[PDB]
Amino acid sequence: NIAVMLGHSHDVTERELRTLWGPEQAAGLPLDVNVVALLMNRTDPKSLITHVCDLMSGARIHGLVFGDDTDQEAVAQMLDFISSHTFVPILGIHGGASMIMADKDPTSTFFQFGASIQQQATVMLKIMQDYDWHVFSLVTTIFPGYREFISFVKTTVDNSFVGWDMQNVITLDTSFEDAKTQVQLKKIHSSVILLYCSKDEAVLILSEARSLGLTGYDFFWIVPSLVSGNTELIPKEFPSGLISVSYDDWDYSLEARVRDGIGILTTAASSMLEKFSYIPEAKASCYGQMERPEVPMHTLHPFMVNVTWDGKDLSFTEEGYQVHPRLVVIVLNKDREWEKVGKWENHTLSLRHAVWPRYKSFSDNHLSIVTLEEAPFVIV
Amino acid sequence: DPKIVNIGAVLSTRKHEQMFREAVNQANKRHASWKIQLNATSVTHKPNAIQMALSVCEDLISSQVYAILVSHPPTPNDHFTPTPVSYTAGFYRIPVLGLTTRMSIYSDKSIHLSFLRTVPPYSHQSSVWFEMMRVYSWNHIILLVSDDHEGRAAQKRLETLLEERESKAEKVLQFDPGTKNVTALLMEAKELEARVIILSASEDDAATVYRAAAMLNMTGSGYVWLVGEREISGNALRYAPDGILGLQLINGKNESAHISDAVGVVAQAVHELLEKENITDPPRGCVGNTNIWKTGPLFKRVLMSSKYADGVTGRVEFNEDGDRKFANYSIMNLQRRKLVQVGIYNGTHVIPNDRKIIWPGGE
């Protein structure tokens, strides 16, 4: 059972070496299972459908741990559709099957382990309050999820007692030529700016804003993912020192992600056998469908939501939210690269910088007072 | 000399396919014929989903289409009609049009990023709820919802409208979809200070709520009802107290007028767009190509702003989210069965008829 599909568009570090060990390890859940693997090429709907259907000829009680490398957004949705009308739980790992989609049909079973936008906003609020900035604006543009983004930000701001100063909400949606953009840009005067746009929109907004002067030596931009790509492909007009958060790929390698997926599948099978003592199959046919109604026999839905592995726990919930994602915070480097400061491991940030390095924006009274405790003059 | 373009896509039945062909031929005779031809194809529905996906990918491959019509099949109560098609055409940026698919999931643009529709979804039903209650001197509102997507969208729209007028609802009592007991929720709702129960359920759930409220002695003597378009059709109409205001859409079950309006607006947009810079032909094959074409979003943007005036359904125009603006609902009220028309709503334009309104009870 359990088949994994790949094909090494970029990382050719695979071959038969990937199909090594897995469920054997020290796991005490043995049965008639294997670690069957498969390689492929660039994905098109016809080719992808045919390949997954062909794999359904033998993957009777199996699953797929497919991963991609491109940036085509519809890949996740097509995976969701296949998972829906096949009853085969699957997961997503790299790139295309890594951007979490908002809603899924209930009669579906797959859980990509990315991170929700709300989680990003929570981590960003945590880091902002950690540096005690509080006052900030929320300039944005028109793009899907902007409304829920704004509402969640507002509700999270209001539901605490630390006193954030909420002002200067800008939601320009009228191209970038009229006076509304100009007055909206001129109105803001704070030092903490939070943006949310889509790639070229963000770069155009920043290119307009630099000409106003809001890109001085005492300003911050905390853009949420969006303009991050999957590499050091920052646009040349991105000045420097852009604060961002993103999913981790350097402290987590695919060789371990595949192992974690295999372990999750095996643990789910062990739980099902411990609770149902029998796991059926669904290898009737991929094609020639619409021949049978629903059959809730051994649905994986209740057997995965609270599953750990080797002590480490990464149990999911409802949507593809993994409760404990390995988000990492990065900054733009002087040499146009991404740094690595702090890692969201626990609810604590665990940052590395005691003070901010004051990154040079484009290509003064704070001093160091020193004293020690003594007498009723300085008290520790 | 003409250049060939191949709009045209899935319909319900063969008669509908022939009607589509005659409609496109009608759309050719007007204006241009010496530059553009736009002959059309067709293909019918299938039960199996994956077979439909393969068929629509064949359709994309063999013709290099520029748009897609996705009218719903004759077997009802599935809401599946446009989803698989959409996903395939979502891979690229070729827009698709819906014909009778009134549901709220498609209104999203982060998940169905290439979808248009010439029908308004249920959130606008919430909007008309608010308009009527605002000009009816009834500002209390106690709304019921099924814990699903469409209920959440309706409640969000209603509350968002209510915020501008600076008012507030009373309760958002929600119930699990497809459940069997709702007695506790009605009992909890009984002891309040509201009389304008507003519910947006889905068919059988609404029927069982009707039955429970009938048993619990909630009908009549004040506590006036309101109900959405689908809450009074089907089995729900069997179990119903007198006085409901089952708001519903005028000329929405028809599809002839919709096919006409769609082909008209698409042809207008295409003739407007081929005056531009170098436009690339759309991708074909389905097996040798994996890239989106550049002129997709530009085509959708052009299509969005388009005012087809002389149509069978009025000045069809598109709200920026991809829905249809300025519909016309008929506020059908019930009295001794055989729902009788009582007024007409046309967008901040609610106007009753000369008939007589009776409330639950009969006072």
Instruction: Dump the DSSP string for A299-314.
Output: -SGGGTTT-EETTEE-
Among B54, B58, B83, B111, the residue to mutate for chain A (most A Cβ within 10 A): B111
Instruction: Give yes or no for a contact between B182 and B175, defined as CB atoms under 8 angstroms apart.
Output: yes
Helix (H) or strand (E) holding A327: strand A327-330
- Residues in chain A within 8 Å Cβ distance of B108: 102-103, 144
Compute the distance between CA of residue A380 and CA of residue B3 in angstroms, rounded to an integer: 84
Cα distance between residue A307 and residue A95, in whole Å: 24
A145 Rama sector, left if φ>0, alpha if ψ -120 to 50, beta otherwise: left
Contacts of B295 (CB under 8 A, 6+ apart): B279, B280
Sign of the Cα pseudo-torsion (A256, A257, A262, A264, in order): positive
Closest CA to A45 of B63, B92, B43: B92
By Cβ distance, the residue of B50, B53, B290 closest to A43 is B290
Left if phi > 0, otherwise alpha if psi is -120 to 50, otherwise beta: which for A305? alpha
Nearest CA to CA, how far is A160 from chain B (Å)? 23
Cβ–Cβ of A290/B91 closer than 8 Å? no
Contact B248, B230 (CB under 8 A): no
Flag if B53 and A73 touch (Cβ within 8 Å).
Answer: no
Gap between the Cα atoms of A9 and B147, Å rounded: 43
Residue B40 φ then ψ, to 5°: -125, 155
φ, ψ for residue A262, nearest 5 deg: -60, -45
B107 is written with which tokens?
């209104």
Backbone break loci in chain B, preceding residues, C–N > 2.5 A: none
Is residue B267 a contact partner of residue B39, using CB atoms and an 8 Å limit?
A: no
Identify all chain A residues contacting B149, using CB atoms and an 8 Å cutoff.
Answer: 103
Cβ neighbours of A53 in B, within 8 Å: 50
Check B289 against A44: CB less than 8 A apart: yes
Cα–Cα distance for residue pair A259/A281, rounded to 1 Å: 23
Q: At what angle do helices B149-164 and B123-134 cross, to 10 degrees?
A: 40
Task: Name the helix (H) or strand (E) containing B160.
Answer: helix B149-164
- Residue from the list A42, A74, A85 with its beta carbon closest to the beta carbon of B50: A85
Q: Which amino acid is at A60?
A: R
- Tokens representing A108 are 């579906």
Tell if the CB–CB gap between B109 and A144 is shorter than 8 Å: yes
Q: What angle do CA B323, B328, B334 make, to 5 degrees?
A: 125
Judged by a CB distance cut-off of 8 A, whether residue B57 touches chain A is yes
Q: Which residues of chain A lie closer than 8 angstroms to B91, CB-CB?
A: 45, 72, 74, 78
Nearest to A319 by CA among A90, A98, A103: A103
Half-sphere CA count of A191, side-chain side, radius 13 A = 9
Please answer yes or no on whether A45 and B91 come within 8 Å at the CB atom: yes
Q: Which two tokens stand for residue B128?
A: 């008309």
How many CB pairs lie under 8 A apart between chains A and B?
Answer: 66
The partner residue sitting opposite B57, judged by closest CB among A45, A77, A102, is A45
Where would I find the beta strands (DSSP E) of chain A?
A: 4-6, 37-39, 192-193, 220-221, 244-247, 308-309, 312-313, 327-330
Using CA atoms, how far residue A242 sits from A331, A341, B209, in Å, is 6, 13, 54
User: Which segments of chain B are extended strands (E)?
Assistant: 68-69, 96-98, 115-117, 143-146, 174-175, 198-200, 226-227, 245-249, 329-333, 340-341, 343-344, 351-352
Interface check B51 vs A, CB under 8 A:
yes
Q: Is B111 on the interface with A (CB under 8 A)?
A: yes
**Nearest Cβ partner for A289 among B50, B149, B292:** B50
CA separation for the pair A340, A338 (Å, rounded): 7
Dihedral sign (CA B247, B253, B257, B258): positive
**Residues 6+ away with beta carbon under 8 Å from B179:** B205
Q: How far apart are CA B346 and CA B351, in angstroms?
A: 8
With contacts defined as CB-CB under 8 Å, which chain B residues touch A46? 54, 57, 286-287
Put simply, whether B14 touches A (Cβ < 8 Å) is: no
Cβ contact, residue pair B50, A49, below 8 Å: yes
Q: Cβ distance B5 to B66 under 8 Å? A: yes
Contact B68, B96 (CB under 8 A): yes
Nearest CB to A81 within list B84, B109, B290 = B84
First-to-last alpha carbon distance for chain A, in angstroms, is 64
Beta bridge partners of A246: A328
Q: Does A85 sit within 8 Å of B49, measured CB to CB?
A: yes
Residues of chain A in Cβ contact (below 8 Å) with chain B: 42-47, 49, 53, 72-74, 77-78, 81, 85, 101-103, 144-145, 286-290
List strand residue ranges (DSSP E) for B83-224, in order. Answer: 96-98, 115-117, 143-146, 174-175, 198-200
Determine, for residues A45 and B286 on separate chains, whether the beta-carbon distance falls below 8 Å.
yes
Cited resolution, angstroms: 4.0
CA distance B336 to B244: 11
Two structure tokens written together for B127: 């909007």
Question: Cβ separation of A77 and B111 shorter than 8 Å?
Answer: yes
Structure tokens at A62: 């199996």
* B86, B114 Cβ separation under 8 angstroms: yes
Helix intervals (H) in A179-276: 179-187, 200-210, 254-276
Alpha-carbon distance of A83 to B112, in angstroms, equals 18
Answer left, alpha or beta for residue A250, where phi above 0 means left and psi between -120 and 50 means alpha.
alpha
How many other CB atoms are there within 10 angstroms of residue B129's CB atom?
23
Retrieve residue A315's tokens.
Answer: 């149990």
A73/B113 CB distance under 8 A: yes
Tokens standing for A291?
């021949």
Pairing relation of β-strands B245-249 and B329-333?
A: antiparallel
- Residue A218, number of CB atoms within 10 A of its CB: 9
Q: Which of B83, B149, B286 sits opposite A46 (nearest CB)?
A: B286
Residues in chain A closer than 8 A to B88 (CB atoms): 45
Nearest CA in chain A to B57: A46
Instruction: Write down how long chain B is.
Output: 363
Rg (CA), chain A: 25
What residues in A contact B84, CB-CB < 8 Å? 81
- Chain B nearest CA to A24, separation (Å): 35
Q: Is the CB of B80 inside 8 Å of chain A's CB atoms?
A: no
Q: How many Å apart are CA B294 and CA B298, to the nearest integer?
A: 8
Q: What is the spatial distance between Cα A249 and Cα A258, in angstroms, rounded to a whole number?
A: 13
Under a CB-based contact definition with an 8 Å cutoff, are residues A254 and A93 in contact? yes
Gap from A201 CA to chain B (nearest CA, Å): 14
CB nearest A81 (choices: B48, B87, B286) = B87
Structure tokens at A63: 């699953």
Instruction: Point out the residue among B51, B91, B110 whose CB comes nearest to the CB of A102.
Output: B110
Structure tokens at A327: 């988000």
Which three-class secondary structure state does DSSP give residue B59?
helix
CA dihedral B7, B11, B17, B22 (to 10 degrees): -50
Contacts of A332 (CB under 8 A, 6+ apart): A234, A238, A240, A241, A242, A244, A338, A339, A359
Report the C-alpha gap between A210 and A219 in whole angstroms: 11
- Based on its alpha-carbon atoms, the radius of gyration of chain B, rounded to whole angstroms, reads 23
Q: How many CB atoms lie within 10 A of CB A45?
A: 24
Find, among B220, B208, B254, B227, the residue nearest to B333 by Cα. Answer: B227
Instruction: For chain B, count helices (H), then strands (E).
Output: 9, 12
Q: Which of B50, B51, B61, B80 should one mutate to test binding to chain A, selecting the residue with the greatest count of A CBs within 10 A?
A: B50
Query: For residues A46 and B57, is the Cβ–Cβ distance under 8 A?
Result: yes
**Hey, are the CB atoms on A287 and B51 less than 8 Å from each other?**
yes
Which residue of B lies nearest to A72 if distances are taken between CA atoms?
Answer: B91
Provide the token pair at A135: 């006052």
CA distances A374 to A368, A371, A377, A378, A379, Å, are 19, 9, 6, 5, 7
Contact A221, A245 (CB under 8 A): no
**What are the CA-CA distances from residue A148 to residues A106, A117, A155, A327, B108 (Å)?**
21, 10, 10, 21, 12
